[PDB]
Design a protein around this ligand. Structure first.
Ligand SMILES: CC[C@H]1OC(=O)[C@H](C)[C@@H](O[C@@H]2C[C@@](C)(OC)[C@@H](O)[C@H](C)O2)[C@H](C)[C@@H](O[C@@H]2O[C@H](C)C[C@H](N(C)C)[C@H]2O)[C@@](C)(O)C[C@@H](C)C(=O)[C@H](C)[C@@H](O)[C@@]1(C)O
Length: 49
RNA sequence: AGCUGUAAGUAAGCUUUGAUCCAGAGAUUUCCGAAUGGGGAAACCCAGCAUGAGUUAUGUCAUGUUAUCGAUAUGUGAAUACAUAGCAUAUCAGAAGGCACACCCGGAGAACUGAAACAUCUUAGUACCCGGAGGAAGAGAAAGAAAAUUCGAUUCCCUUAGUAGCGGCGAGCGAAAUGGGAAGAGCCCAAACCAACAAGCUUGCUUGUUGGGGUUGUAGGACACUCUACGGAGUUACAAAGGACGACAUUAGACGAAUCAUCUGGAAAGAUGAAUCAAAGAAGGUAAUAAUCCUGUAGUCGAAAAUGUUGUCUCUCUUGAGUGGAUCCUGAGUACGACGGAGCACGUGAAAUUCCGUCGGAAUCUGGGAGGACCAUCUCCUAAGGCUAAAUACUCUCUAGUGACCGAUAGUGAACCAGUACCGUGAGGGAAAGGUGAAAAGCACCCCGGAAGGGGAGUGAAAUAGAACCUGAAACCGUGUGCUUACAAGUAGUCAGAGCCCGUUAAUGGGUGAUGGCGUGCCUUUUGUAGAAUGAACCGGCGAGUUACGAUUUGAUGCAAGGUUAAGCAGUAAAUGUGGAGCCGUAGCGAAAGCGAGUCUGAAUAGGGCGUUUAGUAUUUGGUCGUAGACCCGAAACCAGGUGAUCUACCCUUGGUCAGGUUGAAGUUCAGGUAACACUGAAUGGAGGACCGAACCGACUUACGUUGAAAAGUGAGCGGAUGAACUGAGGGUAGCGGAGAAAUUCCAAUCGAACCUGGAGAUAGCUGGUUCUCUCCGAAAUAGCUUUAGGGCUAGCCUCAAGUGAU
RNA sequence: AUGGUAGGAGAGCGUUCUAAGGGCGUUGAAGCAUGAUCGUAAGGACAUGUGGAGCGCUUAGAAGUGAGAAUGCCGGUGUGAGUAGCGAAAGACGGGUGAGAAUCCCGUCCACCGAUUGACUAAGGUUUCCAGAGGAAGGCUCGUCCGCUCUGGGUUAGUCGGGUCCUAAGCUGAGGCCGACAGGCGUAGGCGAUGGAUAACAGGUUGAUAUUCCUGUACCACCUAUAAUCGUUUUAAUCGAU
RNA sequence: AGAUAGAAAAUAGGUGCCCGUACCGCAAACCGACACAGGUAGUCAAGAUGAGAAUUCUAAGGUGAGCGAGCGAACUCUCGU
RNA sequence: UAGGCCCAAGCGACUGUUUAUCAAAAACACAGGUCUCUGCUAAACCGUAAGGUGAUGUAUAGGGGCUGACGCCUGCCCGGUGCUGGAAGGUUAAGAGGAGUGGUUAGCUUCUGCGAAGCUACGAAUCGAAGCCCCAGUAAACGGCGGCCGUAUAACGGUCCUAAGGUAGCGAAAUUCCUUGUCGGGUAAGUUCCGACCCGCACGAAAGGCGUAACGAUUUGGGCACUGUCUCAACGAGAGACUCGGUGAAAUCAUAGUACCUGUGAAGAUGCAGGUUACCCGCGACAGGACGGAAAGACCCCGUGGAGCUUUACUGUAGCCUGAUAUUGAAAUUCGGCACAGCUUGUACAGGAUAGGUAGGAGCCUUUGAAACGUGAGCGCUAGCUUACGUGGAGGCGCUGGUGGGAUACUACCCUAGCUGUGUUGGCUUUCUAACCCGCACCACUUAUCGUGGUGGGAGACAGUGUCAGGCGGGCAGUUUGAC
RNA sequence: GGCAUAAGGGAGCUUGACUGCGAGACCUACAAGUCGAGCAGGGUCGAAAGACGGACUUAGUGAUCCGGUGGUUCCGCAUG
């Protein structure tokens, strides 16, 4: 998903995205240590490096 | 017992050994198209490998095979020593990719429009862009909702109610609680236990693995207490009986009713006389209208995959073993919240569900935790930790079988040659034309000009019934005959009369055609029109008032102390019957609590407002409003998805072309004046967005063309003509864009923003139209206000209907 | 005593069916189109044509109901004129053929284009090419030609032009990068002529093809036999790079 | 390099696939609704005259124009005095 | 078949380009100027991004703006706006801190507020960067270069206001209203033309001024040649006119046999209604009707009908700057928390015997020592004030009493501080590397510079990216532009 | 338009610059706009009858949202 509005003071609307905070890091996927994008929230408590 | 599709007639065969047909099963199935050997401008070109045939051999041909990620076993394994990747294999090719985008779930998501734009809001989470599955999903056996005394594991589809609420409190949007149909079907990780394995470890333990155990607690288990199992049995699921599993349908289907004869035009199916046999007896199609020719309807037997699918249905179930909840377990970046937003009827906020980014950080029996602002009581969970049921959606046309229906400007654009002629570069747009049979019997035969006629001829119950056998009509228009009719000034008619006729569906009938008076449309729009205001020959598909469904005002009644049905169910797609989990009147008043023939106001019980002093609807059914898009036709334009650089503008790569003349740059070199060669005379040389001028390229004047030869041309002159020249082939840039020596110029005869489809019947306070009836009688026409003023609303002037009744 | 584009309550007709009743009808029954009736209607009961098998009346109900214009649409039809025009250029006569000739064929003379109105090759078009025979239409006539019919047909390559070669601009592109999706970009590599590479000329011959067919003379490749020659197969003229 | 013996050559034999090919083609056959005075890349191009591919006439080769044709004012258009 | 020429002015240097289809020009280009941006993964531009152009370039280069060969030149104003820079003056949002306050509660009297412990809604003392404000510069940046009375800053005087009021050269001009201005030349006659004047409505110096050889299908004036252009006819061909034809269309479909004469219709007249004239029908020769059309007027209105374009119209936004946070680490320096607890003087007419900027302070310290005397902190104009005391000993004081203009008993506590180390908390600036990032170099996969890995180098907790905040934002959008 | 019934100056004060209605009150499309009696119900001036619900009369201004006060009569997230 992750679209929605930007709203003005007179309450106009323009469509707009919210992007995740992807950072490129080297994780240990199956086999090699590989570089990949993953969000900062996801490596808060999800996945080893 | 005939047959050789449509798209007809021979040779023909079949063949009683059963043709042609009709069902079922198989076999063959070129080439292209995810196309997948490689390539490509689909339907073509070019290969390899392995067999095989051929060949003295090649060449040639035939048959197989050769496009990425998963699984089995692996193997090798550069920068860098092994490893593992990767890698190259061998196999199943496994599996991707096939969609009526009608229903469904997701992602992303306009706009014209409404408000008398709108920008909040609405249109609308709509179009249709993309992705999924599919005969669904979601949900779910609950931090589940319900808030009375709860409740229905759920769950999903037809009452409350246009209510509560939301809302530039505008336009508008718009619930749920309290139930019918259908109906439950329960699984995990967690706790400890146990048994093996290995590893660490020092064989103790721990780690982990495999398995039984258990999924809700005002407790489940180790336990701790205590003593039962195939009792029931069960397949849509966890044990399946997979079973002989006991009817798929009794489905292909096919056989299989029963009547009828006579007289007058072809025949009876008009008048006589008869009949039909029971589950059919019922409709409906055939030179004549057979509930009794084709046939069904009834009956019959019924075969492949069938087996109603069951009442033992092998295996095999699960008889539950009762107390406590005391200690452990009950799910992690999480409950849990800030900040931006979205969805919830609700305009984000005082928010109970979701997204991004950041925070962080619980608890355990003295459990904790959760529920449209906080603390105590009620319901819930043992959320997040997880799941998965059926009944529950929906029909291109699938398939078959059927109807105040399409009756063929038709359900269809197309019941015929139809997505075809044709049009467009392409996306795309898109017609016209339909119609024996009684039987071709289609004019043998025969006679005069090719076509076409005139005769006979005919199957011809009837060819002015001749290829226009669907016949077949009209009108416009015709054209050839004739009866009457010829000094004039014309809304062509009408009211006043010599010649010629003569009468049906019958009686001042039926007329026909000559003279003096008088003389303006469907029409529309107007103060006013007949045009010098608009628009117009004939015919016609053929061309301008439903309901979802509401509101309000004008017949009959259950039937009036009174109101039930909506859905549902049973019935032939009817009537009808049934239907209280269910829905207007009999009472009003107040903002409300509340009171009640009254009540509000008032601190009053006061006045005064609004009521009382009977009539409604289960009602159902005949004019006007509302929502629909709403009497019809017509914009300029907006948005979304696509198609276009074969024209033209730039550019890229690679090619080509330019008669002939003239001038004579830089440079060189000799010599008149020549001597400190030196200036300037001559030879040479061949430069240039040089000059004149053909081909080629342009387009300044003019004439001609202007229903042109031509949707930009011809004649005569004219500018450029070795360059910032001209030109071919193949490429590239695309519309919220491109290109532009710049003109609002060009992007397929189009451009202050192309073309096609769609939203889309956009919107149109403006213009035009608005018909077969005829009613009869009856109203006419200004003040006031106006995000808006040639429009609108209320009053006036109204018709119609009731009423009081001197007004 | 008795008008009104806006007004209310009115009696009626074309299509259809119920829902009926009752009729006209295969010695004929239509309807429809031409007939004296009904009439304000709309709408129906007896002489030609039609056919040749379909309709009315009565009562009631339902409306693809409801027919002069909208610069309306068209199955569409047909008018309004012997008018405008017939699209640049030189023809004349004789013969022939024929149902019929300013037109077709043959002849002679004359004329026009001549850096082209000539001759080749591309693109493009796709049977128009060539013979016969009728052209019902076609052609700004006729047929007594082709651009309708029948076939009789008719297109021949080692060397010509393309593919089994090479690459440019571009276009695609395994792995890779990016991106709500769809998708965009891009590496080796592929594809891609307008360029590079590559072997044939003279004569004869048909109604219709020709560097293709035939005749002569050549040239270029590939394969198999044929022989002397090079003879560590390293090297060696040969092989020969990845 | 490397690799094999090892060649080739010159003769004699065989063998040589696929696609195009007709016709129009600066036009009656292409693009232009048309048998339309337009547009359409390249090659060849004889004699006289001339500098010339200019001009005028002509060879070769093509064609008599393509349905329209026969008679004889105003006016209009092209042309000459 | 094959250039007409000469004299004179405008504009533009030139060849070139342009509105396919009414404009070829004086408009565009141009070679030259000049300004400005940009140190290389350049700026600029396209794209959501990746990629890419610039450029296989590197300040003698590249992008943007204005001017437009050449020659002589290019004056004044930096107040206003824009751009640049600086001092940094002040001001702030998201944020961090936590002084304090409400809301609940056994909590406390139980007729009642230490809100205590905790839970909750707040909250200021603050700090916090851009922008904004200020100051300087810049006019081949945007712009401006005068009113006023004297009088057509014309003369020169006055002002006015911010900043200045037009230098050269031109000048009735492609610019002049009055206006055909006036005078001369050219002609018989000159509104144009040329020369001259200056009273420049309203010329003027890179939206350049003045001049200029050559060039022009440019504009404009005069002359010669020459002519049917004109004063002011014949001939030739084609169309037309007569005949034939394979021939045979088109543009209005009230409809109606359709004179010259009225009044007047929705007033210039068929049918709308007094007189005059006219026998029926054709063929060759033009405009009243149709106020023709194949044209539903192209400068009012509708109707918040459309559309394009502009801006200091309203509302937004692509984007751009700047913060805060996440990715996101380590040590040290400087100092906020513990910096503890912190001390004193300088000089002063005035306490009391003359002290520290100073605050709450009519009040504490007060056997937890208060003032002179041997003497002690720092220091002196030797008065002796603040402080710890044994020989002595109850006071010095203090905001106030103040020759005073403030003030030191308790207490921040001190600039004048210097500082010993302290559990540990949080700023600032450096410096490190492991995050992360190099269109970064060499080396292998490789076939391959894309990419992946190795090694060395650069850079570095920044940048980049995500979320939030704030400023700017006709670059782009939707609208409105009241209404009479 | 009125006005000497003052419709100008003094006293006391005051405070009628009153609370609820309105028996019974005109204009007007609508919405809106224009005076007395009764006592809930209490005053001021007057010796008293009485007069007084602003001024000689007629101009001197406004639904939705928001703020504040007061009653007091609603609400419930499960119940309080
Ligand atoms: C060749 C023939 C062309 O007509 C012309 O060029 C003549 C020469 C025009 O003159 C015009 C003149 C010029 C300026 O137009 C005014 C221009 O518009 C066009 C190009 O040509 C005429 C006469 C114009 O009439 C007049 O138009 C005026 C608006 C009003 C005038 N009258 C009512 C008062 C009216 O008669 C009007 C517009 O063109 C004719 C319209 C209907 C057309 O479109 C006609 C069919 C053209 O297409 C036609 C083929 O092209």
């Amino acid at each position: 998903a992750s679209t929605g509005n930007r709203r003005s003071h007179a309450l106009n609307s323009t469509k707009r995205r919210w992007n995740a905070n992807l950072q490129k890091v080297r994780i240990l996927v199956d086999g090699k240590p590989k570089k990949v994008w993953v969000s900062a929230r996801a490596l808060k408590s999800g996945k080893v490096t």
